[PDB]
Structure 1
Amino acid sequence: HHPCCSNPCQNRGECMSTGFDQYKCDCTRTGFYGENCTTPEFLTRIKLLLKPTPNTVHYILTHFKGVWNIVNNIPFLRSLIMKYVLTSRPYLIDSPPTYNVHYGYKSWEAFSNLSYYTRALPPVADDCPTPMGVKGNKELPDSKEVLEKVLLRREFIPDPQGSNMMFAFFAQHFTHQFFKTDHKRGPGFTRGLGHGVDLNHIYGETLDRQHKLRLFKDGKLKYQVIGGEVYPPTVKDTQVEMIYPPHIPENLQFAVGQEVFGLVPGLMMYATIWLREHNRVCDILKQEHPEWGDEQLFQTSRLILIGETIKIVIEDYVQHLSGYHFKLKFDPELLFNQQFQYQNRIASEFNTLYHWHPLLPDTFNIEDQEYSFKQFLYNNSILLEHGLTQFVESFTRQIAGRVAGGRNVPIAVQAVAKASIDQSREMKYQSLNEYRKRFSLKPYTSFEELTGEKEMAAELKALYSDIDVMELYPALLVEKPRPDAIFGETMVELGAPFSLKGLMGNPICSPQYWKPSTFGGEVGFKIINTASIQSLICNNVKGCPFTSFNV
């Protein structure tokens, strides 16, 4: 079998077979040398001697609120800290991208083919004796057993950080512009060739789709007015293909950038809000530039909204889920004097860790109703009955479930959770501890160390037998959470590099793009830099309901 099955190379060392039963570790620029890249250089010794654990770092950022309140009001200090954040995090990401599900070695096919999800770790070889390499049994435990014993939800466990349905649906809406698995090819393939924040879930992936959605007047998108309320156009009107069950009436088949947003009313809420925002920005640009044609108005509006999105994702979305008292800032200028690649490739592992199924509630409470999953799915008539204002008000005050901590995946979506396990195995993912070492984290020595308790830990120990073969995805959901937090250590320390790299790697953050002229002047520029989740709702939802990602 393949000589590199045991994953012998440490500290980001590259493994290569040198014969049928021998290997060689490439230790170039790792700071280590030796057969297995384990002997540290002198400077490396000092660095590891001063490098604080992510847990101690998280402690500092989540305590001393008064001190942080002082720091946040010092523009120099605020910029200084945020600069370090935006540099150290994406450093853990290979850019240009390297491996994918078919290539455990670097190749031109892996690099050039945008249909692939890239891979932060190469897949386990096909001829390996055990599914994880050489450790563990001949087969992984039944995904159904892992599912039912430590993942499925008994009592609903609310998020202690206070995340609401606005957060949960925003996450689902935002991430599904770059998480679009090409299931015709397999789980390791994507339909989102933009590999980032291009807002294709609003404008469409292809140019044909975009043009069917556009009004070609004033740079706006097509829309319908129902009861004085602007909503997305229909499939019949645009001939834009959408995924709907055959029993869905023609009038309720809204056409949006993403082909699946019709299936969940929460997604359609944001789709309507963002469509309204695009046309709102067109109005603003038109009286700034009465000479501009339809095409430039549309294109400039898209760039502003892309900037709006990144602005909101960092200073509201990421600000909330991090729990830091420090005030995050979206400022591309911080990276102008640093080494940084303004490009991005979506990693399969980024996708897998973002399957936040425990976030979902048991019922969706709107106004005075409690819709089940069966009642909620495909049901856009719910959106029309209550309206966006009621949706925002209701979802702002409905709490979400805890992601980590185990046993909080709703039974309604158990098939999806089982698929995340099965497809991780299908794509030959490496073990949890391999991904922890990949991201500068200390491996777990026991299951009790992973869960932070005894009951679930014993369940897993009887399933996997070895902590070194524990799978990544079910680990993220049963991981011991940070104190009163929604996530555990692995989730944050893996997701943060992936996220920030995708956000800052956008070309509009490059210095040749980050100009007022890119966004039609200072006015359009200020739209991006003053954007927020509250303003997004206040501008586009009747009555300006209060909203946030907490309470």
Structure 2
Amino acid sequence: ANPCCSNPCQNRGECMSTGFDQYKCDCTRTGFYGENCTTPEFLTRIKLLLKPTPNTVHYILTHFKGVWNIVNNIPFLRSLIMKYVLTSRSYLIDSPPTYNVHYGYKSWEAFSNLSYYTRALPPVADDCPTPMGVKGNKELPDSKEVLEKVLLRREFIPDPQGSNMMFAFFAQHFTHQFFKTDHKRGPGFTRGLGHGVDLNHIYGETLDRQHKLRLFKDGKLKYQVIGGEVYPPTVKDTQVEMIYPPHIPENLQFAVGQEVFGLVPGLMMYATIWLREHNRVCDILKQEHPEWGDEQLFQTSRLILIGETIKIVIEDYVQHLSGYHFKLKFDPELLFNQQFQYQNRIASEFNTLYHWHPLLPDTFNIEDQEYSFKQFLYNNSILLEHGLTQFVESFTRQIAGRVAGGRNVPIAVQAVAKASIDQSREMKYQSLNEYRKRFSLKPYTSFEELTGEKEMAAELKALYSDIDVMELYPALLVEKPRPDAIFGETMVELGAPFSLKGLMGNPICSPQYWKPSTFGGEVGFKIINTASIQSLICNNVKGCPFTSFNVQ
């Protein structure tokens, strides 16, 4: 019924109904005009001939390594390239945010209600003839059928970029501070009201939780010493709610910021490392400021760890997955003379694309042992048995799975991969091609072009009929990877701008925050600016074991 169901507005034009069977396209500031904002202005014609494709740019960043090695060693040259890539990755995100699962038009409710994930593309209206709007059939192909045919893992396909379990678990741990779906409400709702990197997965979402986690001495978090090693406190000791199955003994119910971090020992490992990191910084700050109270030590350390997190995420985590020869740089100063909004809102699509479950192995290898999922899940005994050092050493050695390329979702979490598909439909996601146009990519003209092969393509062809009906979530997982890369084109081009706004949009990056006195002075500022995944592990894990996000 709705005349905007076909999404006729192109180039980010906005559709608005003007009657029961007529629409209008607001082409304001798009660089295009006409009934569907398709005919381009003069200056835009120039842009479209001067800008290279993402793949073109990806090739350059992944080749000419000898050249990039020269760039990386000339500070001013490195800063200027980083400056460019920063601002080029910026025009794509609505900030302040716009739509959400309940609002396909901008509303104050959509802007003001922090309980919703935001939305890169508005939902397909409820009164549309087909799930993707007008194209395709009345009902979408069976999620089970999609899942079993092109997503499930036959045999393990290792990531060619060599991502390890330190990478996979860091990904899960890091992202789960802002991907926290409130299932009571629905899939388009979040419990992470910070909408970014606030480290609530360490400190708790609410004040009441943070206080129960706090020692209230020297600014530290409560902790216990098992054997001679520092571990999170228990639920029994702190009364902070954690999600554990009932058969788990009270002495193994470790209590941390995020309620769900008992699920995986790989999560608990990072929670443990970061807990030690917080208290280590507390000692450093106390030594610098013997006049400080508990509250200021706690607050300042938190700001520093927020800083370390952003640093490590950009210069180690994203550095690895990007595969770029260019050496990325965390430096808020690069934005101080640029137009940029120091705020962020977590997009539902960011959450959806970040379901990187194929990363997981069939078994978890920690020294001698090979644990299955059922042995691993909710088992913190394993962390105690092997200790932090063995965990880091083992995780650094174990290869993770490829995400794109299709058929790599471990069977153990098949219900999750299915849920991602159904909840995407439930939230009325537009099609894959709709999202590609929205992030300035050319739409796939066939299923074979998407996969880069033939068997999965034909398998999808018979399910979806039309390529413009292909769904976003299954696509990125089945998408033809870049050469020897973990991710395909759509994954990177969607995830990058979302991620940037997450890290860079943090208030500590704003000019009035990014100064030494914010962070207790020069030594605290130095902690943020010299942080790395290796230093994080080296300062808090006994023996200073080597680590990286890739297999050596």
Q: TM-score range by the shorter chain?
A: over 0.9
Unmatched 5+ residue regions in structure 1? none
Deviations 1:349-377 (A, max 9, x none): 00000000100000000000000000000
Shift of 1:90: 2.6
Task: Report deviation, 1:87.
Answer: 1.2
Cα offsets for 1:516-547 (capped at 9, x unmatched)? 00000000000000000000000000000000
SS at match of 1:149: helix
Cα distance, 1:421 vs. partner?
A: 0.1
Structure 2 counterpart of 1:26: 26
In the alignment, is the contact (CA less than 8 A) between 1:115 and 1:189 conserved in 2? yes
Query: Cα deviations across residues 227-284 of structure 1 (Å, max 9, x unaligned)?
Result: 0100000000000000000000000000000000011100000000000000000000
> Structure 2 regions of 5+ residues with no counterpart?
none
* 2:272 equivalent to 1:291: no
Q: Secondary structure in 2 aligned to 1:458?
A: helix
Cα distance between partner residues in 2 of 1:355 and 1:303: 28
After TM superposition, the score normalised by the length of structure 2 is 0.99
For 2:527, what is the secondary structure of its paired residue?
helix
Report the 3-state secondary structure (helix = DSSP H, G, I; strand = E; otherwise coil) of the residue aligned with 2:358: helix
> Could you tell me how far apart the structure 1 residues matched to 2:161 and 2:389 are?
24
Structure 2: how far apart are the matches of 1:272 and 1:90? Answer: 34
**Alignment partners' CA distance in 1, 2:90 and 2:294:** 37
1:107-164 superposed Cα distances (whole Å, 9 cap, x missing partner): 0000000000000000001011111000001110000000000000001000000000
- Preserved contact between residue 353 and residue 491 of structure 1 (Cα < 8 Å): yes
Q: Tell me how far apart the structure 1 counterparts of residues 277 and 259 of structure 2 sit (CA, whole Å).
A: 20
Q: TM-score, normalised by structure 1?
A: 1.00
Determine if contact 1:308/1:528 at 8 Å carries over to the other structure.
Answer: yes
**Corresponding position: 1:526 with 2:529:** no
Matched, 1:104 2:95: no
Contact 1:315 1:330 in 2 (8 A): yes
Distance across 1 between alignment mates of 2:499 and 2:434: 20
Deviation at 1:91, TM superposition (A): 1.9
Cα deviations across residues 282-326 of structure 1 (Å, max 9, x unaligned)? 000001000000000000000000000000000000000000000
Provide the rounded CA distance (Å) in 2 between the counterparts of 1:259 and 1:28: 44
Is residue 10–residue 37 contact of structure 1 (8 Å, CA) maintained in 2? yes
Q: Distance in 2 between matches of 1:515 and 1:323?
A: 31
Cα distance in 2, alignment partners of residues 86 and 274 from structure 1? 28
What is the match of residue 200 of structure 1? Answer: 200
TM-superposed deviation, 1:86: 1.2
SS at match of 2:288: coil
- Once the two structures are superposed, residues 359-409 of structure 1 have per-residue CA deviations (whole angstroms, 9 ceiling, x without a partner) of 000000000000000000011000000000000000001000000000000
Runs of 4+ in 1 over 2 A off after TM superposition: none
1:37-72 deviations in Å (ceiling 9; x for gaps): 001000000000111000010000000100000000
Aligned counterparts of 1:488 and 1:89: Cα–Cα separation in 2: 18
Give a deviation string over 1:471-501, Cα, whole Å, max 9, x none.
0000000000000000000000000000011
Aligned counterparts of 1:87 and 1:177: Cα–Cα separation in 2: 26
Quote the Cα distance in structure 2 between the aligned partners of 1:52 and 1:510.
31
Classify the secondary structure of the residue corresponding to 1:18.
strand
* Counterpart residue number, 2:132: 132
Answer whether contact 1:163 1:399 (CA < 8 A) is retained. Answer: yes
Classify the secondary structure of the residue corresponding to 2:425.
Answer: helix
1:10 deviation in Å?
A: 0.1
- What SS class does the counterpart of residue 374 from structure 1 fall into? helix
Which residue in the other structure is 2:536 paired with?
536
- Identity, in percent, stands at 100
RMSD, aligned CA:
0.4
Distance 2:159 2:541 in 1: 27
Count of residues in correspondence between the two structures: 550
Determine the C-alpha separation between the residues in 2 that align with 1:49 and 1:117. Answer: 35
Q: Give distance in 1, aligned partners of 2:479 and 2:149.
A: 14
- The answer as to whether partners of 1:343 and 1:506 remain within 8 angstroms in 2 is yes
- The 8 Å contact of residues 90 and 498 in structure 1, kept in 2 or not, is answered as no
Matches of 2:191 and 2:293 in 1, distance apart? 31
> Is the 1:445–1:467 Cα contact (8 Å) retained in structure 2?
yes
CA distance in 1, matches of 2:499, 2:348: 13
Deviations 1:170-209 (A, max 9, x none): 0000000000000000000000000000000000000000
Q: Is this contact kept in 2: 1:273–1:541, CA < 8 A?
A: yes
1:384-438 deviations in Å (ceiling 9; x for gaps): 0000000000000100000000000000000000000000000000000000000
Quote the Cα distance in structure 2 between the aligned partners of 1:267 and 1:475. Answer: 27
